[PDB]
Amino acid sequence: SQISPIRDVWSTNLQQEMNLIMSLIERYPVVSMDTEFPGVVARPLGVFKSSDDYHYQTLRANVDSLKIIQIGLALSDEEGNAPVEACTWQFNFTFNLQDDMYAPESIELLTKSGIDFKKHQEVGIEPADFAELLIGSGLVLQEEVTWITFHSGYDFAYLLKAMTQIPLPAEYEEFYKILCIYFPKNYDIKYIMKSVLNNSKGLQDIADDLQIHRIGPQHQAGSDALLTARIFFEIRSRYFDGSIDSRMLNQLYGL
Ligand SMILES: [Mg+2]
Ligand SMILES: [Mg+2]
């Protein structure tokens, strides 16, 4: 194939690329997702309702405060085939190294991983513009579409933040309720692999183990989302004989 496996999206081609995605989603209704963001800059203080509560209050504090940098969406059909048009889309969001908050370590990691911060400052997408398109796209609010993620608390929180444009709910129970309306059918591969199957490996280590090859750069959301899709179908085949167990629906790792 002579076209790009990873389609990059900027403010200049947002509408075109969303139009392409909208035209494909009915035929390729399995969406795998990842996000990149500027890390964690703080831990909230006090003592907490649990341990997951502490995890949720950490997430909420940082996701509310730190701007999204990339979202990766990889479409597949129900047997794992990607559209020939694109193995994955990578949405690149507006960010300003001089003005915005971030963990310096994360910016360095993203830079080494290939993020063009100057270009994100110049033609990065506004999350709000993306969110209007995403909500009307057919990908969310639809039981017909399955979302696939990995260790997904922050990743899903960033998408909910984009769509709602307001601070996240104060308690996990409320976050979970609203999340399951926008993403009514989702699987977290980390929950499946570690919490159910007692395999603690990370995304890349699972792919290496299963001999699944990565296309694109590690630690970029497009490539990470595509690897997520490929691991999902291989796990479904190897440990679920083709049919994922319904007890794993909508369970997020660590929350
Ligand atoms: Mg992720
Ligand atoms: Mg990633």
Q: Where are the domains of the chain?
A: 1-255
Q: What is the Å distance from ligand 2's center to 130 Cα?
A: 19
Is 64 annotated to bind a ligand? Reply is no
Amino acid of residue 6: I
Q: Which CATH number fits domain 1-255: 3.40.50.300, 3.40.190.10, 3.40.50.1100, 3.30.420.10?
A: 3.30.420.10
Cβ-in-10-Å burial (0-12, 13-18, 19+) of 109 comes to middle
| Resolution in units of Å | 1.4
Neighbours of ion ligand 1 (CB under 5 A): 34, 155
Place of tokens 């929180």: 157
CA quadruple 8, 11, 14, 16: dihedral sign: negative
User: Distance between CA atoms of 114 and 164, rounded to whole angstroms?
Assistant: 29
Which listed ligand is nearest to 113 at the C-alpha? Answer: 2
Q: What is the Å distance from ligand 1's center to 108 Cα?
A: 17
Which tokens go with 206? 């699972």
User: Distance between CA atoms of 6 and 9, rounded to whole angstroms?
Assistant: 10
Which listed ligand is nearest to 150 at the C-alpha? Answer: 1
Q: What is the Å distance from ligand 2's center to 221 Cα?
A: 5
Helices 127-135 & 14-24, crossing angle to 10 degrees? 20
Which listed ligand is nearest to 152 at the C-alpha? Answer: 1
Which listed ligand is nearest to 226 at the C-alpha? Answer: 2
Q: What is the Å distance from ligand 2's center to 51 Cα?
A: 24
Q: Which residues 6+ apart lie within 8 Å of 187 measured at CB?
A: 146, 147, 148, 149, 232, 244, 248, 249
Q: Are 93 and 69 in contact (CB under 8 A)?
A: yes
Q: What is the Å distance from ligand 1's center to 26 Cα?
A: 25
Closest CA to 147 of 246, 76, 215, 55: 76
Is 174 annotated to bind a ligand? Reply is no
Helices 52-65 & 153-164, crossing angle to 10 degrees? 50
Q: Which residues 6+ apart lie within 8 Å of 193 measured at CB?
A: 199, 200, 201, 206, 235
Q: How was this structure determined?
A: X-ray
Q: What is the Å distance from ligand 1's center to 125 Cα?
A: 19
Which tokens go with 169? 């709910």
Q: Are 175 and 160 in contact (CB under 8 A)?
A: yes
Place of tokens 């490929």: 230
**Host H or E run for residue 197:** none
Closest CA to 167 of 66, 39, 44: 66
3-state secondary structure of 192: helix
Place of tokens 């909508």: 250
Angle at 30 between CA 178 and CA 212, to 5 degrees: 120
